Structure formats: C-alpha cells, structure tokens
Ligand binder design. Structure first.
Ligand SMILES: C[S@@+](CC[C@H](N)C(=O)[O-])C[C@H]1O[C@@H](n2cnc3c(N)ncnc32)[C@H](O)[C@@H]1O
Ligand SMILES: C[S@@+](CC[C@H](N)C(=O)[O-])C[C@H]1O[C@@H](n2cnc3c(N)ncnc32)[C@H](O)[C@@H]1O
Ligand SMILES: C[S@@+](CC[C@H](N)C(=O)[O-])C[C@H]1O[C@@H](n2cnc3c(N)ncnc32)[C@H](O)[C@@H]1O
Ligand SMILES: C[S@@+](CC[C@H](N)C(=O)[O-])C[C@H]1O[C@@H](n2cnc3c(N)ncnc32)[C@H](O)[C@@H]1O
Lengths: 275, 275, 275, 275
C-alpha cells in the first residue's frame, strides 16, 4: 500500500528533508553536469515526491515530466508549480500520478526520455511481497523502459550493506535527509529464513512550535524499505536494461571502489542505455 | 494477545505434538526421576495446555494442580479429566486458569509446591510487549514464588541461541513435537534496535484425510516466540528466586557443558529453592 | 461473529441474569409443567449457556444433554457439573459444544429427544449475515430435527414487534434478566432496504463494589439481536417441521390472543412434532 | 472522518454524477439568474468537491473561491483549473482545503461574500457525532458567517422526509446524480431511540470497460448521510443567521408548497442574510 497514504510523512517532508538549499547543494553540480554532459533536455522523474529535484531541473530549465505514486506527496509538488505558474518553465512542468509497477501504461514514453531519475532512496520502498524479486524486476524494468536509447538512468539506494552489517545505518553527512528535528528513529530489521526482507523505520519529526518555547510534541510516521545490497542491485538494475547498458556506481556522488575506506550512505547508480 | 484465541493450535495440537507415546517416551523417565529424587508429590503445572504432561504425573500417582491462561487449551485437559473422572487420581486432579503475570493471586500457593514445572517452551510464548524484559522478569518471578523452599522449578525453552545464530532452527529429535503431518514451517526473526525481539514460525499440520488419497487442505496456524538465549535465561531465571537457588541447565535431558559439540534442541533449567 | 469471544457477557452474566431464584421463580413451574404434560424425559438444551435452565431440569431429575456454541459460556456450565459431580444426576449430565447451523452433525439425534428447549431469546442471536433468512431457516431446521415425532420444541424470542414498533423495548417483568446492576442499555435499530436487519443494545452490569461505596467502574458489554417478528417467526418455526407440527404461541407464559391488551415481553413458541 | 479518504468515490464521481451538461442543464439558468438577480460576483463554494458547479461559475465569469474538506476530490478541481490555466477566468479560480466545522479560520471572509453555495446534498454528510445537533449548528453557523450582509446562501439536502417515510428515496429525475452505471445501492437506515440518526448508502459504480464487451466488474464505495427533514433544516438553517435572514425553500428548483402533490428529490434552501 501507499506508505504515504496518511500524508503525515508528506506533511513534514519539508522538515524531514531538512535544508533544501543544502541538500540540493550536494550533487546539484554533478547531476546538472552529467545531465548536460550527455545533453539531455527530456527528463522524467519517477520518484518526484514533493518534487524537490524536479523543481530543480525545471528551474535549471530542462523538460521535466515527473510522476509519483502517492498523490499526498504529489499534492505539494503541485502547489509549487501553481504558485510559480507564471514562471514559463513551471507553466510547462508536468506532474502526474504513476506507479513504477504499472508505469508501462501510466506514462507512455514511446519516444522515451533523454534521462530518467529515481533519487532519494525511493525504489527501496518497493517490497518483496511475492518472495521472489519478481515485482522489483518488473518495476526496475518499466523504469529502464522510460529511457530513450542513449538516455540515462539515475537511481539510488541507501547503503544497506553497512546498515545490515552493523545492524545500524551510517547517519551524518546524509545527503538527502538531514533535519535538526528528527527526534527519533527506531529501526526494525526483519530477516526471513536468513534473508534480509524488510527494514522498518518509525519516525518522529519535531514540528516547530509544539506549544511554548522549546517544548516536546512531534509528528510521527513510519516507512519500510527493502535492504538492497550493492552487488544485487548492480546486477538487478543492469538486467533491467537487458544487459544493453553502461553501468556505474558512485558512493555519495564520488567514485566508489569496492573495499574502499569511505563508507557511503547512498549508492548512486548511473546507467546509459545503449539498447 | 492470546495465540490460541482462534483455537487453531489446540484443535490439531494433538497432531502437532504427535504420538504422546513417543512424546512422553522421552523424559517421562527423566521427569519422573527428577521430581522423585527430590520427593516432589505436590506439583503445579503452570503450562497445563492440553494436559499432556500434567496427565502423566497424575497417571503416575502425583498430587498435581495445573493451571493455564488459555481455556481453549485448558478445556481439552478438562475434557480428559471428566472422561476419566471415576479414577480416584483424576477426580483428584485440579485444572484451573491462571496467568504467570498474575500468578501470585490466581493460584494461592501459600505453603508452596514440591515442584513447579513449565515444560514445552511455554515461557517463550510470553512477549516482551513492554520493551524491557519487565513482563518476563515478572512472570518468571510469580512462577518462582509457587515453589516452596527446597522445592524445584523445571522450565525450558528451545535453543534460540543457535536458531538466532543461523537464522534457522534445527528440525530433528523434537522430544515435544514430532509428526509426519507438519507441511509448512518458515523462520522469521525480528530484531529491533539491534536486539532479537521475536521469532515467528508458520505451522501447517496435515490432518489425516484432507479429502481423498492425495488431496491438500490441512489446518493452518502459525506461532511466534521470544528467542530466549541461554545466558539471559540463566540470569533471568535465577534472579526470580533472588539468587537463593541451585541452578542447573541441561542439553537435551542430558547435562550441558558450554562448547560441547552437541547441539541441544531444547534447554531444561532445574532450580532448587533454598530460601 | 461470536458475541461472547471477548467473554464479557459470561463473566458477569450471572449478574446480568440476576437472581436465578427469581429467574427460575417463574416458569420453573411453567416449564416443568409443559415437559411433564408431554412426558418429556430426554431433553436437549441447544442454548445451554451458563447452564441455568439446563441445570434445573437436571436438578429436577431429567435426562438432559445440553449443547452450546460458546465454550466461554459452556465452561461455566461445565464448572457447575464438576463441582456437583458426585450427585448421580449431574454425573449423568451431558454438556457439549454444537452450532445450530450444523446441529445435524454436531449432536447425533438419531432417535430424537422428548423435548428440545431453546429458551432465553438465544435464537435472536443468530444474524441474517446472508441477507436472506437462509441461515435462520437453516438453524431452525437442524434444531427441529432433534425433536422426535410427538416430541416438543420450546423456542422463544423477545417481543421485537413492539420494540421495532416504538423503537424502544419495554423494560419490565423481565423473567430472564432482572437486576439492580444494569446501568446502561440504549436501543439502536438498523433496517436495510426497508427491513429491520438488526437491533443493538449496550449493556452495563454494575458489578458489586467497583471501588469504595459510591464509585463507578463496572463491566462493559453490548449485544445485538435479530428483531424477529411474531408472524415471521411463527411461519419460520413451523416450516422447520415442514408443516407437520402443532404450533402454539404464548404471551408471557400465558396464552396469547392477537390484539389482546397485554404487552408480552417475550414470546414462547410451543411445537409438537407429528411426523 | 473524510468519507472521501479512499478517493474511490472521487475516482468515479465523474461517472457517478452522470452527464454534467445535463446535470448542470437543470438549475443552471436559475442559479446564474438568482446570483445575477442580486448582482453577486463574489461567490464562495463550500462543497467544491470535484468542482462541478464552481467551474460553471468560473466559466460564467464570477469571482469564485471554492473550498472542500476532501483533498481527494479537490484534487480533480485542481487538475481542471490547471488544464485551463491559460483561461483568464480560471487563472483566478481559487481552490483551498477547508472544513465547514472550522471554516471560521479555514477561510477568512472578513469582507464576506456576495453569495455562498453548498449544493449537491453535501451538508447531509455532516454526522450527529455528539447526539445533539451541536456540530450541525456550528457548521451551518460558520457557513452563514461567510455570507456578506445582503449576500445569499444556497444550501440543499435530499428529501429525507420521503426517503424516511417510505424507507426508500425517490430515484428518477435526480438532478445532481444520474448515471447509467450505478449498478447498485443498498440503503441502510439506523434510527436510535426512535430518531433517524444515519442513512448509509453502499454504492456500486459501473466503470466503462470492466474487461470484454459489456462485462460486470465495478467500483464500490459507501457514503453515509444524516436524514435532514424539511422542518428541522428550515429552522436550523435560519437560526444559523441569527434569525436575521430571508428564508425560502424550493422543491427541485421549483416553488415548493407544503402538502404539495409533486415530491422533490432535493430541497434547495435559498437564504438572504440581512444581518
Ligand atoms: C523517500 S520519497 C522521495 C522523496 C524525494 N525523492 C526526495 O528526495 O525528497 C519516496 C517516493 O517514492 C514513491 N514511490 C514508492 N513506491 C512507488 C511506486 N511503486 N511507484 C511510484 N512512486 C513510488 C512515493 O510516492 C514517495 O514519494
Ligand atoms: C506450547 S503451550 C504448552 C503445551 C504443553 N506444555 C504441552 O507439552 O502440550 C504454551 C502454553 O503457555 C500458556 N501461556 C502463555 N502465556 C501464559 C501466561 N502469561 N500465563 C499462563 N499461561 C500462559 C498458554 O496458554 C499455552 O498453553
Ligand atoms: C442469551 S444466550 C442463552 C442464555 C441462556 N438461555 C440463559 O438463560 O442463561 C444465547 C446463546 O445462544 C448460543 N448460540 C448463538 N448462536 C448459536 C449457534 N449457531 N449454535 C449454538 N448456540 C448458539 C450462544 O452460545 C449463547 O450462549
Ligand atoms: C456529494 S459531495 C459534492 C459533490 C458536488 N457538490 C456535486 O454537486 O457534484 C460532498 C462534498 O462534501 C464535502 N464535505 C463533507 N463534509 C465536509 C465538511 N465538514 N467540510 C467541508 N467539506 C465537507 C466532501 O469533501 C465532498 O466533496
């Protein structure tokens, strides 16, 4: 189900994300570069969310059409495009509901897109409901299909290898989500038959105010992720392109070499479809 | 929550347990031997259940009073009593409801029992719902207070150390549950905040028949236990008697020496009150 | 759904019913008289419940076998039996589980009973979940089939005609339930597609004590019945015996003539199998 | 709670409404007339829903700012304003979330509005949660407060007098909702202590396609209303204006005289606040 249905997460996301100028500060020069370095104007955002990155591309004047499964979150991307409905770029910003699993129809690529982006550890949200990675394969497949030949694919996932290994994630220098308000996170790892199956996080977001000066009282929600490990996604994602693609994985938007000292929080998988 | 409220476990429990014969085959000697060695006549079975173990001691001429929290299970025990209500022993059997959490008031020990047995890995059914082993430490105490000075306490639990170590329990030499009817059992360990909070298994007891020869359709029920580790249980159980006790831990009805090659399926803890 | 699964009704049922004395005070004469008039020795109580009515007949030297679908309730009957298990009559009492919907296989009548009683407005507990009185018409049948040719069937129900008529039931002269402890009972009638589908009432049994003298805190439970109207029940019940029966309907343990000024609180239906 | 939370009703509303050109055909000339006959340009729509009527007013060039409690429905109003964002009238169409109960703040009228509209039997959606019509009074009150002195108020409610009396509504010539797809409606009336309290309708909407040519398979949802009777709303609504207002009720947008032959589906209450 849409873990964002109760729109409580989407309610504090602005806060949950933390500083946008800062969150976006990291990797903004690299994405905009890579996207331009391959000369892509047509960009589809499959995890638009509230639209933090889409808006960025809109502003940097690309042709972005963004989709997302939760209208609760989308609802906000929408508000922005409206407030900025006078800005020509934004008058052309596209926002539609869509689901990776049924994307094939949800968003007719036909021509395809110059680049496809699925940032902020979204895909990890898709669960292994069937036991087999069937769905994951399908989802990934449909995304790969949105990229025009020679197009790109920028998808990532938190470093679950480190999180699973030390049973705890590496917080601090977390590029996508840093807020002085996240007062609590209770991690819950459920492994079945010795296979990590679900990682459930119970959040506590400190909403400014909460009554008198500096007083407890926050917003709570919970998100569950699949702990995708590098090796597996690497292959899995590649297999999505039918093998006809160029694969490249980064640490936290820096070159990543297996067995390296630095432990990245996320793993940015960049893909170039050749067929 | 009462794992037996739906009454799926009890209805086929008889099969789940298997041949009481082979069930009792083993330690009916051991058990009978340990209570007698300490001259235990008045026994209290805080985990009566279907009544298996309680019935025996009864049949073996003991003064037994058995209590359980689940009437669905207790009722079958009761059932047996009525059937054999002409036999003086049985007419002398006491079957009643009680809950470890409130044992102190449910079953008025006053003087105490010669030996209180909690066999069957019944304790591991008690969750740590509070988060801190408060309830456990509590239940274990109340029980302990039913044991008279010098008396005994025989409480066991599966070997969750190995289970938790390998993510998979060892199915073999199950002295308490052995059948040809178990068709589906899968392991799901759930650990929160880096601590194993619970172990879930899905049970499928193929009840004789299920249609013509060669037809599916058996009873379905799954259970969830608390992976109690040796060390913690050892500590946990002895504090129940406030340190005034003689602790003894056995492998599979055999002494247990740490590091010993043998992998015990269960762990039988034997205590002797001294205060 | 089993209205007694939570076991709130039974726990205080004793109080809900009131003084069995006054309870039985009335129709213990009536009942005792009707069965004897037809020389009914072997009786089956398909609504045993706590065992109130069943116990009496037993105490009144009858050959009674009682069944009920709710063990929570049956257990208390059972309890009684064990307590008085030395009295030949009781040791001869049969208490078992059964469900009208499947009575035919639950209780093997074979020969049949002299008289089958279903007093207490127990039937109105059976909802029309299907939409069509399919289940009712069914349950009523299975019951009927437990009655031997010439035997009897005494099944009753509250006067839902008046209830449904005035939206409010008449609280007075309750031969089955009279107490000073009932603190809250509100009427909610639900009719779908222009037909009264259900009547719901909220029960509050003020259990003695609830703290010091003058302190709230009683048990809380509410029930829902099927407003069975006279006509339909008359029709419904007779068809159960396939027209081959002698129907008789009484007011409040008194004959009932349509239009009669008196408002019966209950309706006792008396049938005599002739086929 | 927002009965439109599962947005399934909002999903088929387009179909549920039926033909808009037709639905709007009735009463379009009358509303546009009365709104102009009193020269109102500033109109607030408190039950915007998908915005069927707001859009109308927008198109007919009025100054409409529409609010509604369910963002699921609002979501669609929004989509339209965007598609027609190039249309000057529409570029100024206002859509915000708001709840009658807390309207006072949700929408600052201050100046107030020339006219307020609450059509399509929306208000009936507000339940009597407190037993007293408290909430109803508050809600209504807040709405009355949105109307500028001399402003108007057009609120309606289905004819529950006829529905309640014949336990069945008068379908056919239903102005607001007529679709050749509504394959099923199961009415459920719940009266408590002889007072109609809730009318629950379980809908079945035939969504074109459903597989092969003409094949079953529809969308289902359920709405619950309060059965407001003419007399009561008349007074209730008037009292909302503090008595300082002009009251007028129509049948189906035609003069309505008590005890009249023609039985209306809806009762259009038109109000003129004078103070
Ligand atoms: C963590 S949020 C993204 C936040 C945003 N990317 C950012 O960086 O702030 C994950 C998003 O994944 C989307 N999502 C999850 N499963 C999806 C699916 N199957 N199809 C489409 N979107 C999905 C959700 O609706 C949610 O907005
Ligand atoms: C595995 S069963 C026992 C089976 C039985 N030992 C045998 O060998 O057939 C565990 C029992 O623990 C009991 N139990 C669990 N929590 C309890 C509690 N708090 N108080 C009393 N009994 C409890 C249940 O009612 C259940 O019958
Ligand atoms: C009001 S109680 C009877 C109380 C009892 N007559 C007395 O006077 O105390 C109704 C009984 O109907 C029984 N009952 C309801 N549906 C049943 C069914 N389908 N089969 C058997 N018993 C059923 C319940 O278990 C419940 O005990
Ligand atoms: C039947 S729909 C309206 C359809 C639309 N008026 C038409 O004619 O097609 C009723 C609307 O009332 C709204 N509603 C219900 N209770 C509300 C409240 N307390 N405040 C604001 N809107 C409310 C819902 O969100 C829903 O859109």
């Amino acid at each position: 189900p849409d873990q964002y249905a109760d729109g409580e997460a989407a309610r504090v996301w602005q806060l949950y994300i933390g500083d946008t100028r800062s969150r976006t500060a990291e990797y903004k020069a690299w994405l905009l570069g890579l996207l331009r370095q391959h000369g892509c104007h047509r960009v589809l955002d499959v995890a638009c969310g509230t639209g933090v990155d889409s808006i960025m591309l809109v502003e940097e004047g690309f042709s972005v059409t963004s989709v997302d499964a939760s209208d609760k979150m989308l609802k906000y991307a929408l508000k922005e495009r409206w407030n900025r409905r006078k800005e020509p770029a934004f008058d052309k910003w596209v926002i539609e509901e869509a689901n990776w699993l049924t994307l094939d129809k949800d968003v007719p690529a036909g021509d395809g897109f110059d680049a496809v982006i699925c940032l902020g550890n979204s895909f990890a949200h898709l669960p292994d409901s069937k036991g087999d990675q069937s769905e994951h394969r399908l989802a990934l497949k449909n995304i790969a299909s949105m990229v025009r030949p020679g197009g790109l694919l920028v998808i990532d996932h938190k470093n679950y290898d480190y999180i699973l290994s030390t049973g705890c994630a590496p917080p601090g220098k977390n590029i996508y989500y840093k807020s002085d308000l996240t007062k609590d996170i209770t991690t819950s790892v459920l492994t079945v038959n010795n296979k990590a199956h679900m990682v459930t996080l119970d959040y506590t977001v400190q909403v400014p105010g909460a009554g008198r000066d500096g007083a407890p009282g926050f917003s709570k929600f919970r998100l569950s992720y699949y702990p995708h490990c590098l090796a597996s996604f690497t292959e899995l994602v590649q297999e999505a392109f039918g093998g006809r693609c160029q694969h490249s994985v980064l640490g936290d938007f820096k070159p990543y070499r297996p067995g390296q000292a630095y432990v990245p929080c996320y793993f940015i998988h960049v893909l170039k479809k050749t067929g």
